[PDB]
Design a protein around this ligand. Structure first.
Ligand SMILES: CCCCCCCCCCCCCCCCCC(=O)OC[C@H](COP(=O)([O-])OCC(O)COP(=O)([O-])OC[C@@H](COC(=O)CCCCCCCCCCCCCCCCC)OC(=O)CCCCCCCCCCCCCCCCC)OC(=O)CCCCCCCCCCCCCCCCC
Ligand SMILES: CCCCCCCCCCCCCCCCCC(=O)OC[C@H](COP(=O)([O-])OCC[N+](C)(C)C)OC(=O)CCCCCCCCCCCCCCCCC
Ligand SMILES: CCCCCCCCCCCCCCCCCC(=O)OC[C@H](COP(=O)([O-])OCC[N+](C)(C)C)OC(=O)CCCCCCCCCCCCCCCCC
Ligand SMILES: CCCCCCCCCCCCCCCCCCCC(=O)O[C@H](COC(=O)CCCCCCCCCCCCCC)COP(=O)(O)OCCN
Ligand SMILES: CCCCCCCCCCCCCCCCCCCC(=O)O[C@H](COC(=O)CCCCCCCCCCCCCC)COP(=O)(O)OCCN
Ligand code: HEM
Ligand code: HEM
Ligand SMILES: CCCCCCCCCCCCCC(=O)OC[C@H](COP(=O)([O-])O)OC(=O)CCCCCCCCCCCCC
Ligand SMILES: CCCCCCCCCCCCO[C@@H]1O[C@H](CO)[C@@H](O[C@H]2O[C@H](CO)[C@@H](O)[C@H](O)[C@H]2O)[C@H](O)[C@H]1O
Ligand SMILES: CCCCCCCCCCCCO[C@@H]1O[C@H](CO)[C@@H](O[C@H]2O[C@H](CO)[C@@H](O)[C@H](O)[C@H]2O)[C@H](O)[C@H]1O
Ligand SMILES: CCCCCCCCCCC1=C(C)C(=O)C(OC)=C(OC)C1=O
Lengths: 54, 75, 85, 383, 124, 56
């Protein structure tokens, strides 16, 4: 906790760098997660689900 | 016995000297990283960024290699 | 570096008496003819070189350049144009 | 206490236009500030009026400008007023910048109003450039094309940015509609920065032609400068009248009365006269990116005047050598202007390069040297 | 540029016989063409004063010198706005063009520059 | 304790992180309006004859 504070939080330059890197990771993973979830709740309804017939 | 105090003047300019600035060099580094991550994040959507930078990153880079099927593309 | 009326930031003033007269008491155009002729001549004479020298130099440069350019695109200037390109 | 001082709103007006303490010796070159405010007001009035009659769609734009000329009551006047005032705006802004450079208005403690001023100048250029495109004549289209391709010089992303600014693969309808929206907006941004540079100036007050403090001898802005400003307002309106009513097309290009044609490129594409010196500087550098950098640097270099001027004295009134150098600098800036509209031919190619070097060497070499030497001459000369 | 700089460089020139032989006559003509004396100014009246250092130097002027400077500034401002020149006794004669302020600013700057040096001292 | 402060910086940091990700999404989606609209992208093909075109 001391270690974590000292590395990522104490210097604002480090804190802002950590926040932005986290935002980048969140953005990419959240995109993928929502995509999969949306496809499951709307299964068989989307073009991607019927495309194979054509 | 000591006749005079022992000191020199370090080079300085606009009130900065090398001992001080050298302590801040790492901080500029991290700010540079923050600006780099931030900038890259801002242009992540730009197709050239994906094509030239992001898709080349090992393992992770396949996140940005996505093709529209030719059947689904009017253009 | 500037204050306001009453505390403008002037060093202390002392020993100066100022006098003037009303706009209605004065002739606004008093000495206008003398000013228009003699004052303007003096002021112009004293500044003339600072205008004349740069204007005349750059006009000469332009004149030479434009005359050469005109000449290069005549029949007579064919050969000199060919070298220039 | 008087209401004009007591009430906070009235007091802000009072502090700028009435009780504002001014030097008692401002000469007529201090009148360009109010002329610039006048141009801005005329442009807002005429511009908003033209917007009520103009159509930004590429299929109708050129025709909507003809409709303004031919059908709208006094539309010809409003159009010519708008077009000519854009030129007068640049005459006044060059005069104002000339005044500032000659009298050392950029020196401490006025670095901030000067630096904001440099941004105002960039905003005026962008405003005027976008407005010119709106006519969608031949000069409009090609002007946009060439200038919006200076962004292609930016490495890597440059071409992508160009297509982003066009909203397609060439200057077309998307570009015209976006330039309309931004042309409408930019003058408001410009007015805000104009207000900011005045607020920044109010901490030191106006400089004056002698370059000394005026704290010893102040005059109210009203009535003295109010009535002195009227003289130049009427002199301006006389010049305005002669162009607008008697020669409305003298400052323009006939090719802008031809509708935009993406196929045919006009014989000679030059910018509006007031951009010509920057275009000459760009031509001087053979490299694309080089040329763009130089052209932008030619404006941004104004920001270093506070540093490179080493004088212990503000302004040129008492500096004979600085006055000569200033004269050469100004005339060179006019020669660059002229060279911006000649053909790319001998011997104007090399001349443009020499004039470009002189332009930059003023800031980087001559002014620092001359100002150093004059310092020494004042001291030794008065011993 | 600092007054200190200007003064030091001037002293290097005045030392060199060759240099002074060629610079001093030029400086005297420069001053004649400058024409500040024709508005009744002394050279030192023209120095930029909107700086902490110069405000401090002006506060240290003797009251009489200070009152006279105020008058010369007001008088010159009146000549300026009228587009007239000084005549007669209002013209600054070369013998009246005394460096009344230079000593004060050199002292203010001496301290300011020593302070900057000593702010950067390193115990050896 | 460091643990005590670290917790509150985790909350502040998370908030900064979602605000950063949300701003990036907002900016990217919003500015994309300025990229070529669907109709512009539809223009893409032209056939030209060659029989009519003389040599030189
Ligand atoms: C644009 C829209 C139109 C509005 C008009 C605004 C223009 C007004 C302005 O600023 O200029 C008038 C302006 C008159 O202003 P002023 O308040 O009498 O004096 C300002 C200077 O201190 C005057 O300097 P001076 O007192 O040393 O007198 C010099 C001046 C004589 O000044 C005059 O009175 C004229 O004559 C010249 O410098 C002529 C050059 C010599 C060529 C031969 O005329 C000039 O200064 C022109 C000289 C510029 C070079
Ligand atoms: C053309 C070259 C102009 C050089 C001017 C030289 C000074 C001079 O004679 O001017 C008269 C006057 C001299 O006035 P002054 O204030 O120095 O002197 C007044 C009289 N004495 C000395 C007795 C106190 O200068 C001006 O008024 C200069 C204003 C400069 C405006 C230039 C606009 C050019 C735009 C280009 C922008 C980029
Ligand atoms: C909208 C943009 C969001 C950008 C987030 C980037 C990191 C900034 C942030 O979240 O605030 C942390 C930082 C600091 O938050 P803080 O002030 O609580 O942290 C200071 C104390 N340390 C460094 C010890 C943690 O915020 C700023 O510096 C201002 C930026 C606001 C966003
Ligand atoms: C354009 C038209 C010009 C102005 C029209 C007003 C008519 C002027 C006559 C009226 C007048 O002289 O009375 C003064 C009104 O002036 C005033 O109150 C205003 C004085 C001059 C106004 C112009 C100010 C600067 C103009 C430059 C434009 C600024 C840039 C913004 C676009 C009173 O005033 P007094 O104190 O003399 O009264 C002395 C006694 N009561
Ligand atoms: C102007 C209106 C402001 C209101 C914002 C609401 C959302 C608008 C953005 C579009 C959107 O739905 O974004 C989603 C994510 O939500 C989000 O994460 C956005 C919610 C965040 C709300 C507040 C954050 C900043 C808003 C204003 C700041 C503006 C300054 C910088 C532009 C979808 O995500 P996606 O897949 O479309 O995203 C692309 C990168 N993955
Ligand atoms: C819309 C354009 C502008 C307007 C309306 C405007 C207006 C004014 C006004 C009213 C003043 C005070 C009176 C005067 O000295 O003339 C002034 C002063 C000043 N302006 Fe501007 N200005 C504009 C553009 C610029 C630009 C482009 C610059 C600089 C590059 C600039 C720099 C200054 C400076 C330094 C002063 C203080 C000069 C002094 O009194 O010594 N302005 N401006
Ligand atoms: C600093 C202020 C302004 C400047 C320098 C400026 C400059 C210009 C220029 C150079 C043109 C091309 C004129 C032509 O040759 O026909 C133009 C056109 C136009 N401007 Fe502005 N403008 C300004 C403010 C405004 C404002 C506030 C509006 C409000 C909408 C506006 C609306 C227009 C319109 C509709 C046109 C196209 C019609 C036409 O060409 O006359 N302008 N402007
Ligand atoms: C992304 C956002 C970027 C924010 C960047 C902030 C960087 C500022 C760094 C900084 O202030 O350095 C100060 C340091 C000199 O130290 P001192 O004179 O302040 O003690 O200055 C020098 O060493 C020079
Ligand atoms: C002021 C900062 C300046 C720098 C910022 C640059 C922004 C300019 C435009 C950003 C680039 C847009 O680039 C593009 O964005 C859209 C919008 O999310 C993305 O589009 C993606 O999400 C959208 C919804 O959000 C879906 O409809 C689409 O199926 C999906 O592909 C693309 O994957 C990306 O290629
Ligand atoms: C130019 C068009 C006229 C509209 C006014 C322009 C709008 C900008 C005004 C807002 C900016 C704040 O403006 C600020 O106001 C206060 C009071 O009003 C001024 O304050 C000044 O005048 C008042 C009395 O007149 C004194 O108390 C004060 O000592 C003095 O500094 C500031 O010098 C000015 O910088
Ligand atoms: C810092 C620079 C501010 C923006 C300046 C843009 C306006 C002048 C640009 C020059 C120009 C270029 C480069 C140019 O190449 C061109 O020639 C065809 C012109 O006519 C359209 C131009 O106007």
């Amino acid at each position: 906790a001391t270690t974590f504070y000292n590395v990522f939080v104490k210097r604002n330059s480090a804190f802002v760098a950590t926040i932005l890197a986290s935002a980048f990771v969140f953005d990419m993973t959240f995109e993928t997660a929502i995509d999969n979830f949306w496809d499951r709740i709307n299964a068989g309804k989307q073009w991607k689900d019927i495309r194979h017939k054509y | 016995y000591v006749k005079k105090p022992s000191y020199k003047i370090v080079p300085h300019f606009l009130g900065f000297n090398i001992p001080t600035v050298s302590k801040w060099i790492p901080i500029f580094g991290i700010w540079g990283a923050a600006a780099g991550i931030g900038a890259l994040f801002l242009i992540e959507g730009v197709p050239r960024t994906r094509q030239d930078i992001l898709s080349k990153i090992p393992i992770i880079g396949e996140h940005w290699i996505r093709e529209i099927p030719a059947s689904d593309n009017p253009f | 570096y500037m204050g306001w009326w009453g505390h403008m930031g002037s060093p202390p003033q002392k020993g100066i008496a100022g006098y003037t007269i009303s706009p209605f008491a004065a002739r606004p155009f008093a000495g206008v003819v003398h000013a228009a002729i003699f004052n303007t001549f003096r002021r112009t004479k004293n500044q003339a070189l600072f205008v004349i020298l740069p204007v005349s130099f750059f006009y000469y440069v332009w004149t030479q350049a434009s005359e050469k350019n005109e000449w290069l695109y005549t029949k007579a200037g064919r050969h000199e144009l060919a070298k220039a390109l | 206490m008087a209401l004009r001082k007591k009430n906070s709103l009235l007091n802000m007006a009072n502090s700028y236009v009435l009780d504002s303490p001014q030097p008692s010796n401002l000469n007529y070159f201090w009148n360009f500030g109010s002329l610039l405010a006048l141009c801005l007001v005329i442009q807002l009035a005429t511009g908003i009026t033209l917007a009520m009659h103009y159509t930004s769609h590429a299929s109708l734009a050129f025709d909507s400008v003809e409709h303004i000329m031919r059908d709208v009551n006094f539309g010809w006047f409003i159009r010519y007023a708008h077009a000519n005032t854009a030129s007068f705006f640049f005459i006044c802004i060059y005069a104002h910048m000339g005044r500032n450079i000659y009298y050392g208005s950029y020196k401490t403690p006025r670095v901030l109003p000067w630096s904001i001023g440099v941004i105002i100048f960039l905003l005026l250029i962008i405003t005027a450039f976008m407005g010119y495109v709106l006519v969608f004549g031949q000069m409009s289209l090609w002007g946009a094309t060439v200038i919006c391709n200076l962004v292609s010089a930016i490495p890597w992303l440059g071409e992508d940015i160009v297509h982003f600014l066009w909203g397609g693969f060439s200057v077309g309808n998307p570009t015209l509609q976006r330039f309309f929206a931004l042309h409408y907006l930019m003058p408001f941004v410009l007015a805000v920065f104009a207000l900011l540079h005045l607020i920044a100036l109010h901490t030191a007050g106006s400089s004056n032609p002698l370059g000394i403090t005026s704290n010893v001898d102040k005059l109210s802005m009203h009535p003295y400068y109010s009535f002195k400003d009227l003289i130049t307002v009427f002199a301006f309106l006389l010049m305005f009248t002669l162009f607008v009513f008697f020669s409305p097309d003298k400052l323009g290009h006939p090719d802008n009365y031809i509708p935009a044609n993406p196929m045919v490129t006009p014989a000679s594409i030059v910018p509006e006269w007031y951009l010509l010196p920057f275009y000459a500087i760009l031509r001087a550098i053979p490299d694309k990116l080089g040329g763009v950098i130089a052209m932008v640097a030619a404006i941004l270099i104004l920001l270093i005047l506070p540093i490179v001027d080493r004088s212990i004295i503000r302004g040129n009134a008492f500096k004979p050598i600085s006055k000569l150098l200033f004269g050469f600098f100004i005339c060179n800036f006019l020669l660059l202007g002229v060279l911006g509209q000649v053909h790319i031919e001998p011997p104007f190619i090399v001349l443009g390069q020499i004039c470009t070097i002189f332009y930059f060497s003023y800031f980087l070499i001559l002014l620092p040297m001359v100002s150093t030497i004059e310092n020494i001459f004042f001291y030794i000369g008065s011993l | 540029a600092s007054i200190t700089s200007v003064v030091k460089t001037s002293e290097l020139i005045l030392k060199s016989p060759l240099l002074s032989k060629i610079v001093v006559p030029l400086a005297k003509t420069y001053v004649k063409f400058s024409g500040y004396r024709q508005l009744g100014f002394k050279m030192n009246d023209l120095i930029i004063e909107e700086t902490p250092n110069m405000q401090l130097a002006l506060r240290r002027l003797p009251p009489t010198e200070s009152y006279d400077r105020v008058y010369r500034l007001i008088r010159a401002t009146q000549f300026s706005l009228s587009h007239k020149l000084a005549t007669g006794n209002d013209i600054t004669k070369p013998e009246e063009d005394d460096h009344y302020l230079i000593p004060y600013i050199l002292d203010v700057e001496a301290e300011a520059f020593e302070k900057d040096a000593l702010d950067n001292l390193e115990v050896v | 304790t460091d643990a005590n402060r670290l917790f509150s910086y985790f909350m502040i940091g998370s908030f900064g992180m979602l605000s950063a990700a949300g701003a990036k999404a907002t900016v990217q989606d919003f500015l994309s309006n300025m990229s070529a609209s669907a109709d512009v992208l539809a223009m893409a093909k032209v056939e030209v004859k060659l029989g009519a075109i003389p040599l030189g």
